[PDB]
Structures are given as C-alpha cells and as structure tokens.
Design a protein. Structure first.
Ligand SMILES: CCCCCCC/C=C/CCCCCC(=O)OC[C@@H](O)CO
Ligand SMILES: CCCCCCC/C=C\CCCCCC(=O)OC[C@@H](O)CO
Ligand SMILES: CCCCCCC/C=C\CCCCCC(=O)OC[C@@H](O)CO
Ligand SMILES: CCCCCCC/C=C\CCCCCC(=O)OC[C@@H](O)CO
Ligand SMILES: CCCCCCC/C=C\CCCCCC(=O)OC[C@@H](O)CO
Ligand SMILES: CCCCCCC/C=C\CCCCCC(=O)OC[C@H](O)CO
Ligand SMILES: CCCCCCC/C=C\CCCCCC(=O)OC[C@H](O)CO
Ligand SMILES: CCCCCCC/C=C\CCCCCC(=O)OC[C@H](O)CO
Ligand SMILES: CCCCCCC/C=C\CCCCCC(=O)OC[C@H](O)CO
Ligand SMILES: CCCCCCC/C=C\CCCCCC(=O)OC[C@H](O)CO
Ligand SMILES: CCCCCCC/C=C\CCCCCC(=O)OC[C@H](O)CO
Ligand SMILES: CCCCCCC/C=C\CCCCCC(=O)OC[C@H](O)CO
Ligand SMILES: CCCCCCC/C=C\CCCCCC(=O)OC[C@H](O)CO
Ligand SMILES: CCCCCCC/C=C\CCCCCC(=O)OC[C@H](O)CO
Ligand SMILES: CCCCCCC/C=C\CCCCCC(=O)OC[C@H](O)CO
Ligand SMILES: CCCCCCC/C=C\CCCCCC(=O)OC[C@H](O)CO
Ligand SMILES: CCCCCCC/C=C\CCCCCC(=O)OC[C@H](O)CO
Ligand SMILES: CCCCCCC/C=C\CCCCCC(=O)OC[C@H](O)CO
Length: 464
C-alpha cells in the first residue's frame, strides 16, 4: 500500500536522518577551511594555510577510518540504534563547540567529537537500512539508491544554506546551523525510529561472549598504550609540532592497509590478493583527487575565481550535484549496456583517468592566463564534472570487485578513502599560487598514466 518511493515507510526516517547528518557534516566542511584562514588572519590560529589544508585532509582521513570501526561497536557492544543516536549526539556537540564563542582552542575538541560521532553513526544508519528488508526482498538495491539520494541531497543543500548564513551572520551562527541540522536529524530519527525500526537493533546483534571481553580489552589497551608511547617518544626527540602529529596520523592511516596486505600475502588464491593491489592503489589515488575538492579546489575557488557575487563555499555543492545528475543516467547505462560491458578493473582505470583529467583541466587557466588574476567559475564546474564522472565508474563497483576477489579486505575498500585523504594531508601542502600549474599538471598526468597502466593490466586481473 503506502510506501516511500516503493520502499518500506521506515526508509523515510533513515533517509531524513542521513540527509540532515550529511547536511551538518558538509555544511561544516564547506566553511571550515575558510574559518581556519580567518583565525590565522586574526592571529588567533598560529599555523600556515598549508597546514590548515593539511588539517582538512587528515580530518577527513580520520572520519573515514572511524567509520570502519563503528559497525563493530554497534554489532558487538551497544547496538545499531543507540550507535546512531549517540553518534548523532556527539556530532551535534561537535558543531555546538564551534558555535560557542571560542577561537582556535575549540577546533580540536570539535574535530574529535565529529570523528567519533560520525564513526558511530555512518556505518550504522546504513546497517539499519538493510534491516528494513527481508533477505529475499528485491527492493533492497532500490532502497539503498533512494537512501543515497538523501545523502547527496543533504550534501548539496548544506553549502548553499550554511555558506549563505556564514556570509550573513558569521561563522559561529553558520556552525550553529550545522548543529541544528544534526538536531533535526536526531528528532526525526528518534521519534520516527520508534515507529518502524525493529526493537532487536536496540541491542547488539552479536554481543561479546563472556570469554571475549578480556581479549578485546587487552587488544584495545595495548593499542592505546602503544600509540601514547609513540607520542611520548615524539615529544622527547622534539617532533611535537602540528605537522609532526599530522605525519603520525598519516603513517597510521597508511600502515593499516599495508599491514593488512603484508598479512594476507604472507598468510593459492594468493594471486587474487596481489591482483587487488593495483585496484586498491587506483582507488586511493582516485579518492585523493576527489577529496581535494574541499581543500585545493576550495582554495582555488576563494583565491583564483571571479566569485564576488556569491559565497565561494557554494562551489562545494557541485560535487553532490553532479553525483545526483549522473546517477540515474549510469543506472540506465549499466542495464542497457548488455554486450561487452567494461570489466570492474577497466572501470577503475578509466575512473582514475577522469580524475586525472579533472586536474589536467585545472592546469589550463594558469598556463594560459597566468596565476595572478582570476578566472571563470566554469573551470571548477568542468573539473567537478570530470572527477564525478570518474566516481560513477569506480564507486559503484568498488565494494563489489573487492568482495568477489573476507571481512578484513572488505574494510580495505572503505579504507581506500581514508588512505587517499591521508595522502592528501601531505600533498595539499604543496599547493599554492606559485606551484598551481605544476601541481595540477603533475598529479593530473600521473593519475592518467597510472590509469593507462591499469588498462594494460585489466585483462589479467579480470580472470582472477
Ligand atoms: C558526455 C558527458 C560528459 C560530462 C562531463 C563533461 C565535462 C567537461 C568539462 C570540460 C570543459 C569545462 C571547462 C571549460 C571552461 O572552463 O570554459 C571557460 C570559458 O567558458 C570562460 O567563460
Ligand atoms: C572533547 C573530546 C571528547 C571525546 C568524546 C568522549 C565521548 C566518547 C564516547 C561516548 C559515546 C558512548 C555511546 C554509548 C552510550 O552512551 O550508550 C550505549 C548503550 O547505552 C547502548 O546499549
Ligand atoms: C549543550 C547543548 C546540547 C544539549 C543536548 C540536549 C538534547 C540532546 C539530544 C536531542 C535529541 C532529540 C530527541 C529527543 C530525545 O531523544 O528525548 C528522549 C526522551 O523522550 C526519552 O528518552
Ligand atoms: C598509495 C599510493 C601512493 C602513490 C603516491 C603518488 C605520489 C606520491 C608522492 C609525490 C610527491 C612528489 C611530488 C612533488 C611535485 O611534483 O610537486 C609539484 C609541485 O609542487 C612543483 O612541481
Ligand atoms: C575512455 C574515456 C576517457 C579516456 C581519457 C583519454 C585521455 C587521453 C590522453 C590524455 C592526455 C594527457 C596530456 C598530458 C599533458 O598535457 O601534460 C603536459 C604537462 O604535464 C606539461 O608538463
Ligand atoms: C579511532 C580512529 C579515529 C582516530 C581519531 C584520532 C583523531 C585525532 C586528531 C584528528 C586530526 C586533527 C589534527 C588537526 C588539529 O588537531 O587541529 C587543532 C588546532 O591546530 C589547534 O591548534
Ligand atoms: C549529553 C546531552 C545529550 C542528551 C541526550 C538526551 C538523553 C535522553 C534520552 C536518551 C535516549 C537514548 C535512545 C537511544 C536509542 O537507541 O534511540 C533509538 C530510537 O529508539 C530510534 O531508533
Ligand atoms: C536541545 C539542544 C539542541 C540544540 C540545537 C543546537 C543549537 C545551536 C545553536 C543555538 C544558537 C547559537 C547561536 C550562536 C551565536 O550566538 O553566535 C554568536 C555570534 O558570533 C555573536 O556575534
Ligand atoms: C576507543 C573508544 C571506544 C572503545 C570501545 C572498546 C571497549 C573496550 C573494551 C571492551 C569492553 C566492552 C564492554 C563489555 C560488554 O559490555 O559486554 C559484556 C559481555 O557481553 C558480557 O559477557
Ligand atoms: C585506556 C584505554 C584502554 C582500554 C581501557 C578501556 C576500559 C573500558 C571499559 C572496561 C570495562 C571492563 C569490562 C568488564 C565489563 O564490562 O563487564 C560487564 C558485563 O556486562 C558484566 O556481566
Ligand atoms: C577520546 C579522545 C582521545 C583523543 C584521541 C586520540 C588522538 C589525540 C591526539 C592526536 C594528535 C593530535 C594533536 C594535535 C595538536 O593539537 O597538536 C598541537 C601541538 O600543541 C603543536 O604545538
Ligand atoms: C597498525 C598501525 C601502527 C603504525 C604506527 C607506527 C608509527 C611509527 C612512527 C611514527 C613516527 C611519527 C613521525 C614524526 C615526523 O614525521 O617527524 C616530525 C616532523 O616531521 C618534524 O617536526
Ligand atoms: C541552476 C544551476 C544548477 C544548480 C546549481 C546549484 C549551485 C551550485 C554551484 C553554485 C556555485 C558555482 C556556480 C557558478 C557558475 O556557474 O557561474 C557561471 C557563470 O558563467 C558565472 O560567470
Ligand atoms: C542524457 C545524457 C546526455 C546528456 C549530454 C551531456 C552534455 C552536457 C554538457 C556537456 C558540456 C561540454 C562542454 C563544452 C566545452 O568544453 O566547450 C569548451 C569551449 O572551448 C569553451 O569556450
Ligand atoms: C575520450 C577522451 C579523448 C581524449 C581527451 C583529450 C585528451 C587531452 C589532451 C589531448 C591533447 C594533449 C595536448 C597537451 C598539450 O598540448 O600541452 C601543452 C604544453 O604542455 C604546454 O607547455
Ligand atoms: C576529456 C576532457 C579533458 C579536458 C582537460 C584536458 C587537459 C589536457 C592537457 C592540459 C595540460 C596543461 C598543462 C599546461 C602546462 O603545464 O604549461 C605550463 C605553463 O608554461 C605555465 O606553467
Ligand atoms: C565523455 C566525457 C568527455 C567530456 C569532454 C568534453 C570537453 C571537451 C573539451 C573541453 C576542453 C577544456 C579546455 C577548454 C578551453 O581551454 O577553452 C578556453 C576557454 O574558452 C577560455 O576562455
Ligand atoms: C549524464 C546526464 C547529466 C549530464 C550533466 C551535464 C554536465 C556536463 C558538463 C558540464 C560542464 C560545464 C562547462 C560549461 C562550459 O564550458 O560552457 C562554456 C560556455 O559556452 C562559454 O561561455
């Protein structure tokens, strides 16, 4: 009878929950770099703009990493429904912290809250969407597509609204709007969830057995102790600047898949695991370029574009806009393309090439016009158009090609975005007006080349 776009009514609740959470997240992301610039300009924040860019990237890296952990905590300890609720509460607090009359001193607390909160909420709302359907329900894929539409919608409207609020009423009010966005999500989630969600998910579905508690405690304790020890040694040898800590986090984020790879390669489907390395690197490099949209392209938007008549943060709406515009087209495409549809490794290769082209495009205005003036907003429009085209090729088959090639390596796909952002934490420090053309050219061309490399390797990989 009555449905939400053909789906169970409970999808409306989760749709709105994620829409408003993504609203809060991308609303914050769209103005946070500019906020740090402001704090730097007033002498409140004693870092370079390069470091501010680095912060944005490592922030994203840790958000993605945290998301690979939240599912475990919900499934084994607190339950998916409380994970979403309390995750949302932490996220809201994270935005409230930036709305308070503080300056740079509140940045770290806000970042930590949102990292933990998003880690709790993001994997677990997706889990709850699954719970709406039986195993044999063929509506499942349609339901997730609608859910993703809500995600992109929140991501789309947030820079517009939060960016406009920032211009009108300042950063603290704008950040409060992000907080209010999460609050709306929590309201709908809490009261809507009670109506449609299975009570089963109020509790962990795979609770720790009695003998499992101590080994988990030891595991967590040793990890924390090791991490703290590393920080201690860092401060003793004088490696205690902010870039030093960012480097530590970069190393951690990259070492986790590296250790996974070394583990699987050591421990004869050995060929498959090795075959995934080029795909994983391609994913990492793609996500690096895609995630630079809120950092390097955001910098370009503010410094190099004729945008005096609208909030420059609005450029961040282009990424989810193009995802929304492309999605129904590629949905039709992969069904219509019956004969000789490209393999998943081929999609990765071409996807990386489009990401490469998105940067090669951005090298053109500086090379043609110089880098001291300002250029058309359409250069950025074209860039996002290209990189998102790449996303349509690599993202829908990413988890698929990883699974078909089990629980540890599955997480590596989600880790690719974390690793890409960790790489960005290093790379974006190289971007400035002087290096602009070389930056876009070099990393653009590199991605295209590595895409061409993957094309040659596509035949061998598809067989495994
Ligand atoms: C076939 C569907 C593919 C959709 C993606 C295509 C996007 C391609 C974009 C490349 C051209 C955009 C850059 C052009 C540009 O900057 O012109 C500036 C000039 O108009 C200044 O007024
Ligand atoms: C300023 C930095 C603070 C760092 C964040 C501190 C808070 C960290 C974790 C709090 C989240 C705990 C969520 C679990 C909870 O409260 O209920 C779970 C349980 O009741 C469900 O069965
Ligand atoms: C310091 C400012 C933030 C203080 C947070 C106070 C409100 C926190 C979360 C709002 C959640 C909205 C859903 C309302 C709710 O869950 O109330 C539950 C109540 O009816 C019985 O559990
Ligand atoms: C996990 C995959 C890792 C692959 C990373 C590929 C790129 C890694 C390091 C490149 C650093 C050197 C870039 C130096 C550079 O050309 O900067 C350009 C600009 O600053 C002036 O040319
Ligand atoms: C299958 C659809 C997507 C295919 C993408 C086709 C891409 C083909 C060629 C890309 C040309 C790359 C140009 C490299 C370049 O101009 O670098 C010059 C600059 O680095 C000077 O230092
Ligand atoms: C459990 C996996 C997630 C790991 C969470 C640890 C995240 C720790 C730090 C996040 C990165 C933030 C670094 C930038 C930063 O701290 O800015 C603070 C301001 O510079 C204050 O001067
Ligand atoms: C630190 C300030 C935050 C205060 C939050 C309000 C606390 C009052 C009640 C908490 C209710 C916790 C409900 C957890 C939960 O699983 O919600 C799920 C809903 O049942 C819908 O799935
Ligand atoms: C029941 C708790 C749920 C609360 C939802 C989040 C509320 C967030 C902000 C409320 C309004 C905060 C206004 C911020 C503000 O005063 O800006 C100060 C200006 O900078 C002063 O010029
Ligand atoms: C890094 C922040 C998140 C850290 C969460 C890891 C928690 C640390 C050790 C595991 C202890 C979890 C509590 C055990 C529990 O509640 O389950 C009890 C068993 O189900 C009873 O047999
Ligand atoms: C410094 C952080 C390193 C990790 C230490 C975190 C310790 C946090 C919680 C440990 C709680 C001890 C586990 C015992 C427990 O939870 O029993 C609960 C059961 O439900 C009782 O039947
Ligand atoms: C439950 C929260 C526990 C904290 C999460 C663990 C990660 C903690 C720190 C990671 C390193 C980030 C330090 C950033 C920072 O503020 O350094 C600034 C230095 O004072 C440089 O002068
Ligand atoms: C399973 C992941 C475990 C991997 C963690 C291993 C971390 C090992 C070493 C971290 C060293 C931190 C680097 C500090 C650094 O980059 O130099 C400091 C600045 O460059 C100079 O101030
Ligand atoms: C009605 C257009 C489709 C919906 C656009 C949503 C808003 C997304 C981005 C707005 C900021 C970037 C657009 C700037 C722009 O396109 O300017 C083009 C003109 O040629 C300006 O010179
Ligand atoms: C229903 C799927 C088919 C929809 C067709 C999508 C094509 C829409 C826009 C393509 C924009 C192409 C940009 C043209 C261009 O690059 O012109 C460059 C000139 O040199 C600028 O002066
Ligand atoms: C289906 C895509 C077909 C190919 C798309 C266009 C490929 C991109 C560029 C092709 C022409 C390359 C010209 C490069 C070029 O002239 O650079 C100028 C010099 O580097 C300036 O010093
Ligand atoms: C399929 C559409 C692709 C549209 C983008 C194609 C871009 C192809 C080549 C652009 C490379 C421009 C590099 C310019 C350059 O490096 O010259 C340096 C100048 O002398 C200034 O440093
Ligand atoms: C199937 C996806 C491929 C889409 C490629 C369509 C774009 C084709 C050509 C766009 C090349 C970008 C360079 C445009 C350019 O430099 O023109 C100069 C501007 O007119 C400056 O006023
Ligand atoms: C797949 C169905 C949806 C297709 C979306 C079409 C978007 C594709 C490309 C948008 C790139 C915008 C560049 C606009 C442009 O270069 O025009 C230049 C002007 O003609 C010169 O003033």
């Amino acid at each position: 009878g009555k449905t939400f776009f053909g789906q169970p009514l409970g999808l409306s609740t989760l749709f709105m929950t994620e829409m408003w959470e993504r609203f809060s997240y991308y609303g914050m992301r769209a103005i946070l770099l500019y906020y740090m610039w402001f704090l730097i300009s007033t002498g409140d924040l004693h870092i370079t703009r390069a470091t501010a860019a680095s912060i944005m990237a490592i922030y994203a890296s840790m958000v993605y990493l945290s998301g690979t952990i939240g599912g475990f905590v919900a499934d084994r300890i607190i339950g998916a429904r409380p994970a979403v609720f309390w995750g949302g509460v932490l996220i809201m607090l994270g935005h409230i912290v930036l709305a308070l009359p503080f300056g740079a001193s509140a940045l770290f607390g806000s970042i930590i809250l949102i990292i933990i909160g998003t880690g709790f909420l993001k994997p677990n709302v997706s889990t709850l969407v699954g719970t709406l359907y039986d195993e044999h329900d063929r509506r499942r894929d349609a339901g997730f597509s609608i859910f993703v539409f809500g995600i992109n919608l929140g991501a789309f409207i947030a820079p517009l609204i939060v960016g406009a609020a920032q211009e009108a009423a300042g950063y603290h009010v704008a950040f409060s709007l992000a907080a209010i966005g999460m609050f709306i999500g929590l309201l709908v989630y809490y009261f809507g969830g009670k109506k449609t969600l299975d009570p089963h998910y109020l509790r962990p579905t795979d609770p720790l057995a009695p003998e499992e508690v101590k080994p988990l405690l030891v595991k967590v304790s040793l990890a924390v102790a090791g991490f703290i020890a590393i920080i201690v040694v860092m401060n003793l040898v004088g490696w205690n600047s902010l870039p030093a800590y960012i480097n530590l986090l970069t190393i951690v984020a990259i070492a986790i898949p590296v250790f996974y790879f070394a583990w699987m390669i050591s421990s004869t489907e050995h060929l498959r695991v090795v075959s995934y390395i080029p795909l994983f690197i391609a994913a990492v490099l793609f996500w690096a370029i895609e995630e630079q949209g809120s950092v390097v392209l955001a910098t370009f938007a503010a410094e190099r574009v004729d945008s005096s008549w609208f909030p420059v943060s609005w450029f961040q709406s282009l990424n989810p806009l193009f995802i929304m515009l492309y999605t129904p087209f590629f949905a039709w495409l992969w069904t219509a393309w019956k004969k000789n549809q490209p393999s998943s490794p081929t999609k990765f290769a071409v996807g990386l090439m489009f990401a490469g082209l998105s940067f090669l495009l951005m090298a053109i205005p500086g090379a043609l016009y110089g880098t001291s003036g300002k250029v058309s907003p359409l250069w950025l429009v074209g860039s996002w158009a290209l990189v998102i085209l790449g996303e349509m090729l690599i993202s829908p088959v990413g988890l698929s090609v990883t699974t078909k090639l089990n629980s540890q390596m599955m997480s590596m796909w989600f880790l690719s975005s974390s690793v890409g952002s960790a790489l960005n934490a290093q790379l974006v420090t190289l971007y400035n007006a002087k290096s602009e053309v070389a930056y876009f050219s070099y990393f653009g061309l590199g991605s295209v080349v590595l895409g061409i490399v993957l094309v040659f390797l596509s035949k061998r990989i598809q067989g495994l």
